[PDB]
Amino acid sequence: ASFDAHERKFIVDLWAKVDVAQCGADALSRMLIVYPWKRRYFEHFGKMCNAHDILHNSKVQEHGKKVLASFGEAVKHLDNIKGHFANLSKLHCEKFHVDPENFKLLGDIIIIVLAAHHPEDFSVECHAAFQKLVRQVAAALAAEYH
Amino acid sequence: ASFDAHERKFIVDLWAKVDVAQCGADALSRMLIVYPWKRRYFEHFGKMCNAHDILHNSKVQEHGKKVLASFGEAVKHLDNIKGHFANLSKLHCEKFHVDPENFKLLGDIIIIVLAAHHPEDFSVECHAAFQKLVRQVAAALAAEYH
Amino acid sequence: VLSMEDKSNVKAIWGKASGHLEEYGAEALERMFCAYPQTKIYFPHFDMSHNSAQIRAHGKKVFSALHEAVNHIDDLPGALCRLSELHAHSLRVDPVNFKFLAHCVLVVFAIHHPSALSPEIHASLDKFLCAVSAVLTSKYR
Amino acid sequence: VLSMEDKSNVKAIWGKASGHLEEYGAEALERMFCAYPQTKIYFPHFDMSHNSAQIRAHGKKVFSALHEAVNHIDDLPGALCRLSELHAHSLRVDPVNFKFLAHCVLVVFAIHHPSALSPEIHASLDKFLCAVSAVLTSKYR
Ligand code: HEM
Ligand code: HEM
Ligand code: HEM
Ligand code: HEM
Numbered sequence: 001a002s003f004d005a006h007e008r009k010f011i012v013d014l015w016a017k018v019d020v021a022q023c024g025a026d027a028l029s030r031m032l033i034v035y036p037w038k039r040r041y042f043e044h045f046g047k048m049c050n051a052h053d054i055l056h057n058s059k060v061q062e063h064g065k066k067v068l069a070s071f072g073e074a075v076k077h078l079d080n081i082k083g084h085f086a087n088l089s090k091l092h093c094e095k096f097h098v099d100p101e102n103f104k105l106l107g108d109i110i111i112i113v114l115a116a117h118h119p120e121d122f123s124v125e126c127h128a129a130f131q132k133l134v135r136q137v138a139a140a141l142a143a144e145y146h
Numbered sequence: 147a148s149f150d151a152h153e154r155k156f157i158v159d160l161w162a163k164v165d166v167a168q169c170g171a172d173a174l175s176r177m178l179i180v181y182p183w184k185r186r187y188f189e190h191f192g193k194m195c196n197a198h199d200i201l202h203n204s205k206v207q208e209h210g211k212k213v214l215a216s217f218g219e220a221v222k223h224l225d226n227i228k229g230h231f232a233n234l235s236k237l238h239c240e241k242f243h244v245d246p247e248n249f250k251l252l253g254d255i256i257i258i259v260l261a262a263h264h265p266e267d268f269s270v271e272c273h274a275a276f277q278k279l280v281r282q283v284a285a286a287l288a289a290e291y292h
Numbered sequence: 293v294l295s296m297e298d299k300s301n302v303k304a305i306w307g308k309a310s311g312h313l314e315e316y317g318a319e320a321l322e323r324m325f326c327a328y329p330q331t332k333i334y335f336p337h338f339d340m341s342h343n344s345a346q347i348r349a350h351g352k353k354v355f356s357a358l359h360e361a362v363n364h365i366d367d368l369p370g371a372l373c374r375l376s377e378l379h380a381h382s383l384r385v386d387p388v389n390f391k392f393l394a395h396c397v398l399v400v401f402a403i404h405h406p407s408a409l410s411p412e413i414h415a416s417l418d419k420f421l422c423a424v425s426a427v428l429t430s431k432y433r
Numbered sequence: 434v435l436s437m438e439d440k441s442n443v444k445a446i447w448g449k450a451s452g453h454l455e456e457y458g459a460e461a462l463e464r465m466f467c468a469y470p471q472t473k474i475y476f477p478h479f480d481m482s483h484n485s486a487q488i489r490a491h492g493k494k495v496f497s498a499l500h501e502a503v504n505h506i507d508d509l510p511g512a513l514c515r516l517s518e519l520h521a522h523s524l525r526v527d528p529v530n531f532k533f534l535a536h537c538v539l540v541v542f543a544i545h546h547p548s549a550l551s552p553e554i555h556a557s558l559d560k561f562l563c564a565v566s567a568v569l570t571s572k573y574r
Binding site: 172175176179180197254257259261262263265270271273274277 | 460463556
């Protein structure tokens with residue numbers, strides 16, 4: 001659905017407090033540790049044998065910054081999430097070959113990273129507004145899959 | 147993607163040979179037997195304790211006819227599957243409360259029913275054309291979920 | 293399969309929830325009803341207000357069951373046998389719902405114990421909650 | 434969990450594939466590569482032509498492994514241990530792919546044995562293939 005005014009306030013006020021570089025590095029590292037098959041898609045970033053390797057890989061750290069910066073452009077296009085992400089959907093499908101079920105797993109890991117970094121702000125209703133955003137971004141990244 | 151001319155010929159030529167009433171009754175019965183939690187959504191059709199009850203339930207048999215007739219309207223709107231199914235998507239979401247992962251499971255059961263009824267016709271390439279149709283119909287029925 | 297290291301990780305993080313089973317369980321239910329409103333159809337009889345007596349009482353039963361599962365982590369099928377019959381056969385809960393609650397449990401630990409839920413502990417606790425969920429969806433017939 | 438009736442159903446339907454392991458296995462691979470073309474990224478070295486020697490040889494290994502799993506249906510974790518290490522740890526196959534192949538195996542039995550794959554037999558064979566898939570995605574680390 002459209003975001004209502006209360007959902008928008010939750011998302012905009014919280015995103016302004018997020019350290020995107022730190023949260024993005026954390027989120028990408030956690031997805032490769034928690035879902036180890038995802039390492040296959042990134043096997044050009046180096047060996048990722050274990051959590052120690054992943055946490056000390058500068059390529060993983062820098063890529064996670066770009067991914068969460070990209071995700072954070074949703075916050076400025078809440079009316080047009082599917083259209084904003086259509087090229088990146090195509091790029092994941094055709095160039096990176098990523099299975100679209102994986103987008104939902106990274107959205108669940110971003111919620112956990114946000115919850116841990118902003119516990120007083122991540123109220124029941126704030127969480128519900130962010131669960132709707134990650135569900136829409138994951139859907140937009142799956143949309144140009146043919 | 148759009149259906150190409152070879153995919154269209156496969157889908158149109160095969161659908162013209164399908165006994166929709168028989169295949170629809172079979173498909174609905176198999177989904178309630180193979181995925182028993184789906185019985186909760188239909189608990190107004192009667193008791194569905196076991197496969198014997200489900201195979202002898204006239205309400206299940208008649209509903210499966212309507213579902214496969216509805217699915218078979220996709221064959222006449224291959225250019226506009228999402229738009230043709232938008233109301234039925236809304237009705238599943240709001241009135242029936244069906245979780246959208248379930249649409250993919252019924253699409254996989256329709257492929258099996260078609261394969262068993264039309265084995266000489268259900269070639270490797272015919273199967274691939276039908277796998278693309280059921281993937282698009284399942285997506286169209288999930289699309290008005292908000 | 294949960295390793296020896298996974299089993300120790302799950303015990304360590306679960307010990308933080310000692311003394312808090314009702315509180316953390318109530319919060320996990322409130323987060324599931326709000327973030328995934330489609331799960332409310334299983335609980336038509338519940339008062340869905342914040343800290344309702346029904347939600348606090350239900351939250352405490354859920355977390356108590358998880359606490360017993362942590363203590364019997366080598367035999368989850370035996371520890372959760374009665375609950376698998378209830379959810380799968382009697383309530384016919386759609387299996388997608390176990391993922392929503394497992395996610396809301398992780399969020400509750402991230403909020404109360406952010407440093408304790410490190411990347412390796414997160415991986416172990418996610419493996420435990422999938423294992424619990426797999427026993428609870430094992431008896432659909 | 435597979436019941437005693439499920440185990441007998443799986444043995445009965447699997448006996449129809451006796452003598453046909455290479456044929457049915459080749460067909461199941463050809464249907465997975467065509468219907469789910471994204472699975473071809475795991476097999477870059479394969480000739481993807483119809484009845485290629487590589488696809489017939491691979492199909493026969495897959496069905497032979499399933500045949501051994503049917504004979505050891507009471508201990509799938511032990512019967513499939515080496516294959517779980519290969520798929521999960523060495524090949525890092527995304528778990529969504531095991532559903533595509535399990536579906537293509539059912540389609541191959543529906544085509545060759547349509548009356549034998551009745552609704553109750555379908556339910557048992559679907560339960561067996563999920564159980565195989567769960568052992569093969571159990572060792573991701
Ligand atoms: C919130 C969801 C996601 C967003 C916003 C996102 C965004 C991006 C961006 C911005 C790039 C860089 C594109 C470029 O300019 O080349 C990228 C690359 C990539 N992404 Fe994602 N991504 C997401 C989820 C995922 C997931 C779940 C996977 C796999 C498990 C994945 C795998 C990749 C891969 C393999 C690359 C190429 C890496 C490289 O060559 O540097 N992405 N993504
Ligand atoms: C190919 C996918 C599907 C199609 C084309 C389809 C089509 C339909 C149609 C045409 C109706 C009748 C609407 C009306 O006029 O009232 C209906 C009702 C319903 N469908 Fe579906 N359906 C599909 C999948 C599913 C699935 C997977 C479920 C649940 C597991 C489901 C559950 C229901 C329920 C509960 C009703 C209401 C039954 C009644 O009150 O008679 N549908 N569907
Ligand atoms: C970690 C997962 C879960 C655990 C450990 C769990 C545990 C429990 C326990 C201990 C009970 C009480 C049984 C009794 O009083 O004897 C219960 C009841 C119930 N559970 Fe769950 N549960 C889980 C997941 C779910 C999910 C995902 C749903 C639905 C979305 C659900 C719906 C219910 C319902 C509807 C009841 C009956 C409540 C009542 O009658 O008041 N459970 N569960
Ligand atoms: C029922 C499920 C499956 C079974 C029983 C199975 C069985 C096997 C067996 C027996 C081997 C040969 C190992 C050896 O020669 O020692 C193998 C190799 C392999 N499997 Fe699977 N497999 C299954 C599913 C899958 C899926 C879903 C994929 C990917 C989509 C996959 C990809 C591979 C690959 C890439 C190889 C290596 C082939 C080569 O090097 O030529 N398998 N599998």
